[PDB]
Design a protein around this ligand. Structure first.
Ligand SMILES: *[C@H](O)[C@H](C[C@@H]1CCNC1=O)NC(=O)[C@H](CC1CCCCC1)NC(=O)OC1CCC(F)(F)CC1
Ligand SMILES: *[C@H](O)[C@H](C[C@@H]1CCNC1=O)NC(=O)[C@H](CC1CCCCC1)NC(=O)OC1CCC(F)(F)CC1
Lengths: 299, 302
C-alpha cells in the first residue's frame, strides 16, 4: 500500500510573477521583484577576474544606478537606487510589481522544508522541495545561472521567502542567503574552498516519518518502551542525530495514532543500527526529509 | 558527490490560473478552464448512493445548464452548454479564460513523467511529479476533493495536458483520464474494486539513471560486455521489465558519456539480481522514475 507520502512543493505561481533578470556589466543572474525592490546576490557585481576574493565595499562604491539593468521575462524597469544588505543587493526600481503577493521574510532552521523555484535568465524552469540540512546546506538541482533563485514556504496565500541561491560546494550541495542578508551556515560568498560540516539525522522528521508508517499500517517497530526527550538528546549527541524538539504538529500525530513520541524515540535508538531484515515505507534506512507538517498534510 | 538529480516539477503558474471549482448537487471537485471550456470528471453528476454503477448517459440528459455551478478562486462563470466526452464533461461557459496557456491534449505512455497540480475546491495546494507506470497507475498524493486535479508537461511555450484525476485504487495508487476522455489503463469510473495489472521496471528510465550515475563519476558497473536491444527485450518479458525503446534523448546521454546503451542493457541484467554491497547514486536498487529528459536537463541542462 503506497502511503501517498511524496515530495510535494508549493504552487509556484505567486513567486514566478516576481522573478526578474538582473545584469551588472558582464554578470547576469536572477532577482526577486517585490513592490519597488529587486533582490539579488551581490556577487552580480564581480567581474570574472576577481571571484576569488571580491571587495564588495569597493565594488559597490564604484557603482551607479545605471550600472544595473533589470528586465522581466516571466515591464520596463529603471534602477533608481542601490544598496547592500549582507550578501544581497537591494535595488530600488521605479515601477511596483503589480503581482506582488502578500509576503514575509523568515530564516528557516535545520529540519524545515521549503520550495525552490529554479530560474535561469529570469525564466522559471523547475520547482522542487528541499530540507535545510543540520549543516546548513541543501541538495536540490542548481546549475550555472541559477543564482538568485528563491526558496519559500506558504501560510495561506502568504509567502514566506527564506532563501536566495548563491553557490555550490565541492560536494555538490548548495547554500544561499536569507533575506536579512546572512548566508546560511556562515559560508562566505568567495570562490574559495569551504568545507561543509558533517550532516546529522533530523530527529523530529524521522519521528514524523515513523508516525506516517504507523498511519499506513506499519507499526511492527512500536513497542511499549519509551525514551525521554532529555535522554534521547543525550544519546543523539553521540550518534549523529539532532536534538529532538517537539511541536504541536508532532503532538497531533501522537494523538492520531495513540503512539507517544517517547515510544518512537526508543524505536529510533534501536532502528539506528539496522532494520534487521524488515522494511519501513519501502526503505531500509531511516528517512529524515519528511516533516511533521508533511505527514499531517498528506495523510 | 550530490548528483543534483531530484524530483522536479514544472512551474505550475500557467496551470494555476486555469483551475476552477465545479459543483453539481452534492458533489464538488476541480475543473480545468481553457478558453470557453471547463473540463471536469463526469462523476460530478453522480449522487452518492449511485456510485457503484452510474448511468452517466441518463444522468447527463437529466441535467440542464443550471445544474452546474462553476466558481473561480485563484468570479462566477455562467454555464451555457454541457456535454460528455468519454469519462469527462465538457462544459461551455460564457467567459473565455483570459489566462489560457498555449496547450495540447496528448495521452502519455508508460515511463513518461509529468507534473501534477493537486487542488481542492478549485484551490491549488501542491505540485509533484509522477511517472505513468506500466500498469497505468500513478503514485503521488491525492485526498478527498482532489478529483479533477490535472497533470501536464511543458514543451516550449506549449503545455500538454495529459491527466485528470479520477480515483484511488486499493493499494493507494491512483488513476484518471486523458483529455480525449479515455481512462488510463482498463479502468472504469465506477466505485468498484478493479484488477490492476502487474507493474514493471521502466527500462529506458533505468538506462537514463545509469547514465546519470556515469555522468556523476560512478561507473563501476560499466563493462565492455553488451546486450543488444532485441535480446534485452526478450529477456525483459521474463523479468518484469518493459521493452526498451531508444530515443534521441537517450542517444545524447550515450554521446556525452562514451557508454553505449547496449553496455547498460547488459549491466541491468547483472544489477537486477542486486548490487552486492555497492551503491549507485545513494541507491541499492535500480531507479526507474527519472527519464532521459530529466537527466539531460538536471545534469547537463538540455
Ligand atoms: C550562480 O548561478 C552559481 C550557481 C552554481 C553553479 C553550479 N551550481 C550552482 O549552484 N554560483 C557560482 O558559480 C559561484 C559564484 C561565486 C561568485 C563570487 C562570490 C562567490 C560565488 N561559485 C561557486 O559556487 O563555486 C564554488 C566552488 C567551491 C567553493 F567551496 F569554494 C564555493 C564556491
Ligand atoms: C475525487 O476527488 C476522489 C479522489 C480519491 C479520494 C481518496 N483519494 C483519491 O485520490 N475520488 C473518489 O473518491 C472516487 C470517486 C468514484 C465515484 C464514481 C466514479 C468512479 C470514482 N472513488 C474512489 O477513489 O474510490 C476508492 C477510495 C479509496 C479506496 F481505497 F477505498 C478504494 C476505492
Amino acid at each position: 500500500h503506497h502511503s501517498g507520502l511524496v515530495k510535494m512543493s508549493h504552487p509556484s505561481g505567486d513567486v514566478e510573477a516576481c522573478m526578474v533578470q538582473v545584469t551588472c556589466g558582464s554578470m547576469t543572474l536572477n532577482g526577486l521583484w517585490l513592490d519597488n525592490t529587486v533582490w539579488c546576490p551581490r556577487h552580480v557585481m564581480c567581474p570574472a577576474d576577481q571571484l576569488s576574493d571580491p571587495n564588495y565595499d569597493a565594488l559597490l562604491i564604484s557603482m551607479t544606478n545605471h550600472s544595473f539593468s533589470v528586465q522581466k521575462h516571466i515591464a520596463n524597469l529603471r534602477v533608481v537606487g542601490h544598496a547592500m544588505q549582507g550578501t544581497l543587493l537591494k535595488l530600488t526600481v521605479d515601477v511596483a510589481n503589480p503581482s506582488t503577493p502578500a509576503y514575509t521574510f523568515t530564516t528557516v532552521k535545520p529540519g524545515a522544508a521549503f520550495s525552490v523555484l529554479a530560474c535561469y535568465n529570469g525564466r522559471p524552469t523547475g520547482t522542487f522541495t528541499v530540507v535545510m540540512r543540520p549543516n546548513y546546506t541543501i541538495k536540490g538541482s542548481f546549475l550555472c545561472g541559477s543564482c538568485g533563485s528563491v526558496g519559500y514556504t506558504k501560510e495561506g496565500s502568504v509567502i514566506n521567502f527564506c532563501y536566495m541561491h548563491q553557490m555550490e560546494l565541492a560536494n555538490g550541495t548548495h547554500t544561499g542567503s536569507a533575506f536579512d542578508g546572512t548566508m546560511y551556515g556562515a559560508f562566505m560568498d568567495k570562490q574559495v574552498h569551504q568545507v561543509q560540516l558533517t550532516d546529522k539525522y533530523c530527529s523530529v522528521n524521522v519521528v514524523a516519518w515513523l508516525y506516517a508508517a504507523i498511519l499506513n499500517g506499519c507499526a511492527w517497530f512500536v513497542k511499549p518502551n519509551r525514551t525521554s526527550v532529555v535522554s534521547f538528546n543525550e544519546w543523539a549527541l553521540a550518534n549523529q542525530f539532532t536534538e529532538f524538539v517537539g511541536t504541536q504538529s508532532v503532538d497531533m500525530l501522537a494523538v492520531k495514532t495513540g503512539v507517544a513520541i517517547e515510544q518512537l524515540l526508543y524505536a529510533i535508538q534501536q532502528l539506528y543500527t539496522g532494520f534487521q531484515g524488515k522494511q519501513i515505507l519501502g526503505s531500509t534506512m531511516l528517512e529524515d526529509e519528511f516533516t511533521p507538517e508533511d505527514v499531517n498534510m498528506q495523510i
